[PDB]
Amino acid sequence: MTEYKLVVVGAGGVGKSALTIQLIQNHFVDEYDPTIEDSYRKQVVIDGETCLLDILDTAGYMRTGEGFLCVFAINNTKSFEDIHHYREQIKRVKDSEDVPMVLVGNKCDLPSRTVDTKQAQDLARSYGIPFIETSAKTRQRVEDAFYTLVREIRQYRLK
Numbered sequence: 001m002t003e004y005k006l007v008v009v010g011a012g013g014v015g016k017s018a019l020t021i022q023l024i025q026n027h028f029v030d031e032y033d034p035t036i037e038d039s040y041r042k043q044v045v046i047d048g049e050t051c052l053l054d055i056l057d058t059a060g061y062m063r064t065g066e067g068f069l070c071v072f073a074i075n076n077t078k079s080f081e082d083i084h085h086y087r088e089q090i091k092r093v094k095d096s097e098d099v100p101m102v103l104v105g106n107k108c109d110l111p112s113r114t115v116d117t118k119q120a121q122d123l124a125r126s127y128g129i130p131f132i133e134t135s136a137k138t139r140q141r142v143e144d145a146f147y148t149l150v151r152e153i154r155q156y157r158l159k
């Protein structure tokens with residue numbers, strides 16, 4: 001079983017825990033319980049590779065993580081602004097510009113959007129990483145988000 005150490009980062013309340021619990025448990029957490037630091041391990045098959053995912057759900061690990069899910073909420077402009085701070089801190093710690101990352105715009109089921117998809121696409125394009133729009137509430141593209149991050153790490157290891 002190939003291991004992938006994934007770390008979910010982003011401002012408070014953007015749905016990091018909700019996305020992680022949807023992946024692990026197939027259950028939407030409606031209550032907002034602020035996270036300290038939670039670890040999960042899940043065995044999955046991704047593109048035919050049997051994988052062990054080690055997911056660290058952080059509070060709103062930069063050394064141990066191999067790939068980072070950088071989450072903002074599409075109805076929280078400040079959380080989108082704060083992404084740069086998360087990425088720059090990761091880059092500093094890993095002393096690298098190619099660390100595997102996926103940009104996640106969560107809560108896409110909410111109509112009170114203030115981060116336009118074009119803004120998010122331009123940021124992702126700049127960093128050289130994928131962009132996935134999710135909803136933990138409806139479980140839209142939750143697996144896609146985490147599996148895309150796995151694939152980024154896989155491609156990184158193979159150059």
Ligand SMILES: Nc1nc2c(ncn2[C@@H]2O[C@H](COP(=O)(O)OP(=O)(O)NP(=O)(O)O)[C@@H](O)[C@H]2O)c(=O)[nH]1
Pocket residue numbers: 010011012013014015016017018019029030031032033034035036058059060106107108109110134135136137138
């Ligand atoms: N409508 C909607 N609400 C969501 C979605 N994802 C999370 N939420 C809601 O937003 C709140 C915060 O979700 P939660 O996962 O704790 O946030 P978090 O980033 O883990 N926060 P923290 O940093 O404090 O640990 C919860 O009420 C949750 O139900 C989503 O896709 N859609």
Ligand SMILES: [Mg+2]
Pocket residue numbers: 016017018033034035057058059
């Ligand atoms: Mg949390």
Ligand SMILES: [Mg+2]
Pocket residue numbers: 114
């Ligand atoms: Mg605007």
